[PDB]
Amino acid sequence: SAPGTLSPDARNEKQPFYGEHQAGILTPQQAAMMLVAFDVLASDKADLERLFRLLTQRFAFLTQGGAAPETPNPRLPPLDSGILGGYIAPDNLTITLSVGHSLFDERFGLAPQMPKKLQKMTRFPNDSLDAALCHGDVLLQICANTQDTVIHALRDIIKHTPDLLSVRWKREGFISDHAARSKGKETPINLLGFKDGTANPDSQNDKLMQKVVWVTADQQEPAWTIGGSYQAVRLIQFRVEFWDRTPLKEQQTIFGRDKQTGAPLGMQHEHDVPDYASDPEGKVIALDSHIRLANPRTAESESSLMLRRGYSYSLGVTNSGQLDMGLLFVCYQHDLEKGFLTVQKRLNGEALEEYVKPIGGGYFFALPGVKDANDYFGSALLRV
Amino acid sequence: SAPGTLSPDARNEKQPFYGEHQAGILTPQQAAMMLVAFDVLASDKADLERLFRLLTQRFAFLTQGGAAPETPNPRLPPLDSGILGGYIAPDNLTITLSVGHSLFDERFGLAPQMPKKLQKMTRFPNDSLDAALCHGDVLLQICANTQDTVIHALRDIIKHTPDLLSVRWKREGFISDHAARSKGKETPINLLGFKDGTANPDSQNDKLMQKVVWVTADQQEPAWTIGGSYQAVRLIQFRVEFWDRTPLKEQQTIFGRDKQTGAPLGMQHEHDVPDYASDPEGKVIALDSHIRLANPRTAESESSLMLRRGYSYSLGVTNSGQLDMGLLFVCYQHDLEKGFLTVQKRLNGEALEEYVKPIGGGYFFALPGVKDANDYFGSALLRV
Numbered sequence: 225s226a227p228g229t230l231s232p233d234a235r236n237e238k239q240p241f242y243g244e245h246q247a248g249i250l251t252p253q254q255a256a257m258m259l260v261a262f263d264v265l266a267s268d269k270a271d272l273e274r275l276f277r278l279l280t281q282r283f284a285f286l287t288q289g290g291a292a293p294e295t296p297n298p299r300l301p302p303l304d305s306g307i308l309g310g311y312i313a314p315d316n317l318t319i320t321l322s323v324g325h326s327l328f329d330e331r332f333g334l335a336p337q338m339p340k341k342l343q344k345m346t347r348f349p350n351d352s353l354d355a356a357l358c359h360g361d362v363l364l365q366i367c368a369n370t371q372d373t374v375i376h377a378l379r380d381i382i383k384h385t386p387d388l389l390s391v392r393w394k395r396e397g398f399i400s401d402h403a404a405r406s407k408g409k410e411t412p413i414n415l416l417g418f419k420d421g422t423a424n425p426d427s428q429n430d431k432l433m434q435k436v437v438w439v440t441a442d443q444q445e446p447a448w449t450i451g452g453s454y455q456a457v458r459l460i461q462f463r464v465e466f467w468d469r470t471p472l473k474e475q476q477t478i479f480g481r482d483k484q485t486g487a488p489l490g491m492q493h494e495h496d497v498p499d500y501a502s503d504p505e506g507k508v509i510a511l512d513s514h515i516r517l518a519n520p521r522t523a524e525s526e527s528s529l530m531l532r533r534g535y536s537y538s539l540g541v542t543n544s545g546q547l548d549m550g551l552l553f554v555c556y557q558h559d560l561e562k563g564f565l566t567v568q569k570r571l572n573g574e575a576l577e578e579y580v581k582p583i584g585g586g587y588f589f590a591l592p593g594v595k596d597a598n599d600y601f602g603s604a605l606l607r608v
Numbered sequence: 609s610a611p612g613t614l615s616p617d618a619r620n621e622k623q624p625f626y627g628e629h630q631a632g633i634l635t636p637q638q639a640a641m642m643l644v645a646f647d648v649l650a651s652d653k654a655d656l657e658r659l660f661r662l663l664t665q666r667f668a669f670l671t672q673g674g675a676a677p678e679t680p681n682p683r684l685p686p687l688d689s690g691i692l693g694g695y696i697a698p699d700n701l702t703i704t705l706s707v708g709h710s711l712f713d714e715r716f717g718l719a720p721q722m723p724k725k726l727q728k729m730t731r732f733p734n735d736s737l738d739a740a741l742c743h744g745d746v747l748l749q750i751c752a753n754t755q756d757t758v759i760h761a762l763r764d765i766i767k768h769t770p771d772l773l774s775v776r777w778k779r780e781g782f783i784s785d786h787a788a789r790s791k792g793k794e795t796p797i798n799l800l801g802f803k804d805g806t807a808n809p810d811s812q813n814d815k816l817m818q819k820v821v822w823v824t825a826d827q828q829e830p831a832w833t834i835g836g837s838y839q840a841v842r843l844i845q846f847r848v849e850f851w852d853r854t855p856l857k858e859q860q861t862i863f864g865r866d867k868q869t870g871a872p873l874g875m876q877h878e879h880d881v882p883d884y885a886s887d888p889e890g891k892v893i894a895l896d897s898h899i900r901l902a903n904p905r906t907a908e909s910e911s912s913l914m915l916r917r918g919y920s921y922s923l924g925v926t927n928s929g930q931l932d933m934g935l936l937f938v939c940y941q942h943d944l945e946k947g948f949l950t951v952q953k954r955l956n957g958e959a960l961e962e963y964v965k966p967i968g969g970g971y972f973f974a975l976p977g978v979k980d981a982n983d984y985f986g987s988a989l990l991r992v
């Protein structure tokens with residue numbers, strides 16, 4: 225159920241761009257998402273500040289919306305693509321900017337101000353990482369009620385940054401219609417047909433998000449990071465036809481949840497909690513399962529908790545001739561090793577691996593929010 | 609403008625599956641589409657009829673909606689994918705079936721029965737066809753209010769056909785959000801930011817579609833074709849960033865229509881008719897303009913109009929680092945030569961060829977409608 229969902233029909237709804245934190249983390253999932261990574265063509269730190277200043281301006285506009293920028297001189301390219309007609313409605317659009325490890329090399333002199341746990345994504349046991357689709361100096365997470373709004377934001381950004389950014393990879397996706405419209409009531413479904421998001425820590429609870437999601441001042445990190453969040457992204461294909469052929473008994477066993485209800489196997493309500501303490505032979509919920517490995521529920525390692533904010537994607541056909549669909553996995557943590565790396569390490573060997581093929585993504589650090597109109601993305605990172 | 613549009617929220621809206629004609633041709637445009645080509649694996653004519661019958665039953669149930677087929681024995685793969693949850697909502701699902709030239713080879717002895725104008729697609733000057741995105745024994749155009757329905761239909765069909773169908777290529781599309789919500793009042797906006805559909809011939813005009821779109825007895829064709837339609841699909845990339853950095857005057861010149869109003873150039877109204885005979889040099893509406901070439905509005909022209917029911921697509925990043933975006937272009941005509949072939953011959957070397965690159969697609973014959981529940985796809989074709 226956390227972080228919730230927002231209606232696809234809310235053309236006029238606005239999500240606050242300005243805050244202590246960035247939007248599109250705790251924000252209830254919009255119906256459309258884009259993940260688009262860029263390589264940075266900035267020549268020096270000053271050129272980098274230009275970019276972040278430029279971005280703030282653009283996001284602030286796109287996010288709260290307005291009349292389209294018109295073209296009084298037809299001899300110039302139109303200042304807008306025109307794909308939303310003559311008005312740019314907010315449409316719950318949120319754009320979350322995050323920085324990759326590569327950004328902290330010789331190029332901009334930021335090495336000593338790197339986040340401590342931040343690293344490059346390296347293959348895991350089941351991975352088939354394609355380089356075309358990994359890493360990047362910056363990632364944008366572009367979320368909105370509709371595809372239009374998202375696609376509109378990109379091309380605006382591109383238009384304003386042609387000596388400044390270079391598109392590296394991109395995937396678009398969605399959350400499931402019925403649940404999108406359920407305004408937070410129903411849990412979104414993945415293309416494997418299982419409710420997905422259930423056990424996420426409550427996103428409304430400010431105090432818990434300080435412990436789980438948000439970088440806090442008690443942390444060994446550099447002080448610009450305070451208010452940011454480590455971000456893991458994994459592009460994961462499904463063997464979908466093979467899955468559709470797999471016994472229901474086997475599907476639930478693999479996840480350790482009831483497909484129809486979303487309850488832990490044995491139990492009756494989606495927000496029911498299993499107790500593995502009773503089940504150490506792993507006879508109700510398998511030790512093999514995604515749920516039990518993902519979280520042993522020891523509470524001794526509640527420290528590995530995270531907010532997962534994923535989307536289904538569906539593309540074309542694989543080289544091997546099969547359907548190309550799956551999860552655009554996205555998660556936020558206050559600490560990447562304590563979170564994503566700890567859980568994934570813990571998942572290596574799970575029964576699900578036979579059906580899933582991670583192929584892309586990267587690790588990134590999400591910036592602290594932009595406090596007011598006088599601030600800009602990573603302003604603390606650039607002074608100090 | 610024709611064919612009109614349907615709303616994305618219309619979860620309990622249905623489309624008649626049976627009839628003189630199939631749906632998805634004159635049907636207003638739903639928000640989501642999928643073009644999926646299959647290699648037929650049927651070994652003989654008897655297997656083909658098995659297939660055609662099976663597809664009939666499945667579309668009927670899918671398009672008209674119902675409770676998700678319950679799987680009483682868990683030792684089996686689930687009969688439904690469950691990505692739609694408990695209820696398979698009709699959600700305006702239409703499934704349109706068409707056959708490719710390749711189906712009329714020796715395999716099934718239909719060659720003598722082939723439609724007169726049906727042929728393999730071969731390249732026009734500006735093409736960069738990709739073998740992986742061309743042709744197919746059968747093509748299915750699956751459209752619905754939501755991506756969820758359309759995906760669900762596909763997997764259902766696949767699950768039920770593993771000895772008869774093989775996914776050749778697949779592409780997914782959409783029309784602009786606002787236009788879909790307007791239900792016919794607004795022309796769809798394509799991804800170059802232009803109104804796309806305006807001059808489509810009147811699709812609720814009973815009599816007009818018989819001369820224009822449907823096969824009829826007057827034109828010498830195998831009887832079984834009567835009620836069908838020739839279908840031309842082109843997968844077409846847009847040079848998006850280039851277009852975006854092209855002056856608006858030129859954008860408008862190329863198409864010959866006012867970007868903002870969609871009115872013909874030098875006119876005020878979207879549904880205005882251009883006056884070519886007044887302007888033989890082409891000082892208002894260019895000689896190489898898309899509109900003038902595609903339809904020079906004369907006496908001979910009349911024979912070459914068609915119904916366009918195209919969709920936008922947006923994928924990832926091309927191999928060379930640009931945005932993968934374009935049009936899933938689909939049209940219907942009573943005669944393929946008189947229709948698409950004739951218009952594309954005229955379009956060869958138009959100004960737009962700078963900004964578009966056809967890479968896939970093919971020619972198909974869209975079957976007549978399935979008369980009722982006692983009938984099946986291509987029953988007239990197989991019978992004798």
Ligand code: HEM
Nearest residue numbers: 414418419420421422423424460515518519551567568580
């Ligand atoms: C391979 C694609 C994946 C699919 C289809 C998938 C799906 C699911 C499903 C259906 C659930 C149970 C409901 C719930 O969300 O509570 C779940 C739980 C969970 N997943 Fe995944 N997931 C995938 C990958 C991942 C990855 C890569 C991670 C990170 C290492 C992850 C971390 C978690 C966590 C932490 C839970 C909650 C467990 C609990 O607290 O009981 N998942 N996932």
Ligand code: HEM
Nearest residue numbers: 802803804805806807808844899902903935948951952964
């Ligand atoms: C990706 C390339 C294409 C784009 C961006 C595009 C877009 C447009 C636009 C903006 C219009 C004017 C509005 C309208 O009349 O609907 C139009 C008209 C039209 N197009 Fe295309 N189109 C493309 C390809 C094609 C192709 C391949 C054909 C068929 C060979 C075609 C046939 C037509 C026809 C018959 C019209 C109506 C023009 C008139 O009669 O005034 N178009 N298209």
